[PDB]
Design a binder for this molecule. Structure first.
Ligand SMILES: O=C(CCCCCCC(=O)Nc1ccccc1)NO
Ligand SMILES: [K+]
Ligand SMILES: [K+]
Ligand SMILES: [Zn+2]
Length: 367
C-alpha cells in the first residue's frame, strides 16, 4: 500500500520574476516567466502521476501543516521565529540568503511541505502504508538548524526524521539524499547525532560552494554518521549505481535504521540546467529499486521518499514517474526520451568516478 502526497499549494510557491536571484535592472537580468525553481516542474511530475494512471495504484495522503513542535525538532527557535517574521511581512521577503524567498503567508506552504513528509512518515511507520512518495515543495535539504537556504525554508526530511525519533520512538533513522547538490542543511542538523545517519551523493562543489567534502564526517557521538559522496561532473548511471552498491547500501546495512527517508531530487538528470550529471529515468529507477529492496531487507520495507530538487520541466516528470513505478510495481509507460539520452553516455564507470567512490569505502568501518 503506497502513499502519495500532493497539495495544490505546492504548485503555488511564488518564485518571482527572476531566474535565480530576482530580476534586476542595473545588472540587466531581464524578468522571465519561469524561474529556475518554478513550481511547474514538480506540478508536471504530479500531473504525470495522474495522467499515467499511477494515481490509481496509490493511496492519496493529505498533507498536514507541521506544527511549531514538529519544526523545532529539526530547527532552532530563532529560525522558526524568523520564518514567522518573514512570512508575516506585507510582501513577505528574503529568508536570509538574498535568494530564498517566502511571500506573505508562505509559511503555510512551508508547513504543508514539511508536514507532508511527516504525515507520510507517520502512516508508513504505523504500518498503514508500506512505503510512499511525498511530492512536496518547497524542498528541504539545504536548510540547516538555524537558517533557510537554497530554496529551502525547512528541512523536510529532518523534520520527518525528528518526528520518527521523538514521537514514534525510533532509535535510528537514515536520510539518503540523491538530489545532485550537497545536503548541507541535513548534515548540519544531525552533525553531533548518531541517531540519524545522513548520506549525501552530489556533484562535488555544485551547491553550496566549499561544502560536501568526504572529510565532513560529524562530530562527538555523531562522528562517522555523516557520509558525503562527492562525484565529478559528467557522472551518470554507472557512477550512481556504483556509489549505491559500494557505499550507500553497505552503509544502510551497517547502520540498521528503523526507517529510510530518501531526499529524492532529480537534478542529477541528463537534462537538468542546475547540474552537469547524466542520470536517466532508468538510472533513477534502479536507484529507487535498490533502496526499496534494501528497506525490505533491513527495516520491514519502511521507506519514505520526499521530493528535493530537479529543474527540467520536460524530463523530471519521467524521472519521478520511474520512481513511483518502482513503488507501485506497475510499469506502464515508456520514458519517451530513453533512446535520445541513452546515446549520450554516462553508462560506463569512468576511472575518475570509480576513484571518487573508492575514497569513501574506508569510512564504512566507522559505522
Ligand atoms: O536543487 C537545489 C538548488 C541548488 C541551487 C540553489 C542556489 C541558490 C543561490 O543562488 N544561493 C546563493 C548563491 C550565492 C550567494 C548567495 C546565495 N537544491 O538541491
Ligand atoms: K548524523
Ligand atoms: K545530495
Ligand atoms: Zn538540488
Amino acid at each position: 500500500a503506497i502513499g502519495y502526497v500532493w497539495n495544490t499549494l505546492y504548485g503555488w510557491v511564488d518564485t518571482g520574476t527572476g531566474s535565480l536571484a530576482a530580476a534586476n535592472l542595473t545588472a540587466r537580468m531581464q524578468p522571465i516567466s519561469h524561474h529556475l525553481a518554478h513550481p511547474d516542474t514538480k506540478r508536471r511530475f504530479h500531473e504525470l502521476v495522474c495522467a499515467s494512471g499511477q494515481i490509481e495504484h496509490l493511496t492519496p495522503i493529505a498533507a498536514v501543516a507541521a506544527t511549531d513542535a514538529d519544526i523545532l525538532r529539526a530547527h532552532s527557535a530563532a529560525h522558526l521565529e524568523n520564518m514567522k517574521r518573514v512570512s508575516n511581512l506585507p510582501t513577505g521577503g528574503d529568508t536570509g540568503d538574498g535568494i530564498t524567498m517566502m511571500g506573505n503567508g508562505g509559511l503555510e506552504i512551508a508547513r504543508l511541505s514539511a508536514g507532508g513528509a511527516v504525515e507520510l512518515t507517520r502512516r508508513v511507520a504505523t504500518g498503514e502504508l508500506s512505503a510512499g512518495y511525498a511530492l512536496v515543495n518547497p524542498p528541504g535539504h539545504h536548510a540547516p538548524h538555524n537558517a533557510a537556504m537554497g530554496f529551502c525554508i525547512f528541512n523536510n526530511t529532518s523534520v520527518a526524521a525528528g518526528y520518527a525519533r521523538a514521537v514514534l520512538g525510533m532509535e535510528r533513522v537514515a536520510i539518503l539524499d540523491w538530489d545532485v547538490h550537497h545536503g548541507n542543511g541535513t548534515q548540519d542538523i544531525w552533525w553531533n547525532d548518531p541517531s540519524v545517519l545522513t548520506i549525501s551523493l552530489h556533484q562535488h562543489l555544485c551547491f553550496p560552494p566549499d561544502s560536501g567534502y568526504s572529510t565532513e564526517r560529524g562530530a562527538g557521538n555523531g562522528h562517522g554518521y555523516n557520509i558525503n559522496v562527492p562525484l565529478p561532473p559528467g557522472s551518470g548511471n554507472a557512477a550512481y549505481l556504483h556509489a549505491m552498491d559500494q557505499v550507500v547500501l553497505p552503509a544502510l546495512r551497517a547502520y540498521r535504521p528503523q526507517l529510510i527517508i530518501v531526499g529524492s531530487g532529480f537534478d542529477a538528470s541528463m537534462l537538468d540546467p542546475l547540474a552537469r550529471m547524466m542520470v536517466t529515468a532508468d538510472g533513477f529507477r534502479q536507484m529507487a529499486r535498490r533502496t526499496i529492496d534494501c528497506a525490505a531487507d533491513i527495516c520491514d520495507g519502511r521507506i519514505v521518499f520526499v521530493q528535493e530538487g530537479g529543474y527540467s520541466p520536460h524530463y523530471l516528470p519521467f524521472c519521478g514517474l520511474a520512481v513511483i513505478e518502482e513503488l507501485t510495481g506497475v510499469r506502464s509507460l515508456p520514458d519517451p526520451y530513453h533512446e535520445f539520452l541513452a546515446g549520450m553516455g554516462g553508462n560506463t564507470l569512468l576511472d575518475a568516478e570509480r576513484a571518487a567512490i573508492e575514497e569513501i569505502v574506508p569510512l564504512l568501518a566507522d559505522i
